[PDB]
């Protein structure tokens, strides 16, 4: 309520993207032919949970 | 000392793909079996979280 | 205090993948002789472990 | 029975896939054309036998 913002997480179209994403963004498939992925930029990001 | 934060989270669905991220990032990757659609070329509506 | 434990088990057979993760991970890899019937797109009837 | 659960081993629908299955859930490719990967989640994760 303060900043008036919001964050993203991890998120993406495809479980095909969405097993690449993961170990963290060293890898990760972004974008691809239409599909595409969000990788979590937020204060939650780093943590387990 | 123990208490809540809660943030409010953006998730866009169904978009699509700019004109320019339509790419593979090498030639075989994401191929189906031969006799299948690939259906990664269509506007996606699924997500995945 | 030498105990014991029991635990319960899950396992699948005959299921069929759904189309969105029909995928290969890569184009060329599980091919056979080049005579020969990629029986890799079938239903699988089998259960390893 | 206090849980009313059960755990799913390391398991797979073809060697090729369990193969991968080794040193970890790493690299271990998870799907294939129809063909799929059961990584274990277990109490028994971690351990040898």
Same mark, same amino acid.
């Not at chain 2, 943030?7 to 699509?16: A, H, I, Q, R």
């Given at each position: 309520? =303060?900043?008036?913002?919001?964050?993203? /997480?991890?998120?993406?179209?495809?479980?095909? =993207?969405?097993?690449?994403?993961?170990?963290?963004?060293?890898?990760?498939?972004?974008?691809?032919?239409?599909?595409?992925? /969000?990788?979590?930029?937020?204060?939650?990001?780093?943590?387990?949970? | &000392?123990?208490?809540?934060?809660?943030?409010?989270?953006? &998730? %866009?669905?169904?978009?699509?793909?700019?004109?320019?991220?339509?790419?593979? !990032?090498?030639?075989?990757?994401?191929?189906? !079996?031969?006799?299948? %659609?690939?259906?990664?070329?269509? %506007? %996606?509506?699924? &997500?995945?979280?």
């Amino acid at each position: 309520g =303060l900043f008036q913002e919001a964050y993203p /997480i991890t998120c993406a179209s495809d479980p095909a =993207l969405l097993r690449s994403a993961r170990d963290g963004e060293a890898h990760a498939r972004e974008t691809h032919f239409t599909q595409y992925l /969000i990788y979590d930029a937020s204060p939650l990001k780093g943590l387990s949970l | &000392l123990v208490g809540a934060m809660d943030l409010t989270f953006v &998730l %866009p669905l169904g978009l699509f793909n700019p004109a320019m991220e339509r790419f593979a !990032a090498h030639a075989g990757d994401l191929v189906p !079996a031969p006799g299948h %659609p690939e259906p990664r070329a269509f %506007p %996606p509506r699924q &997500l995945f979280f």
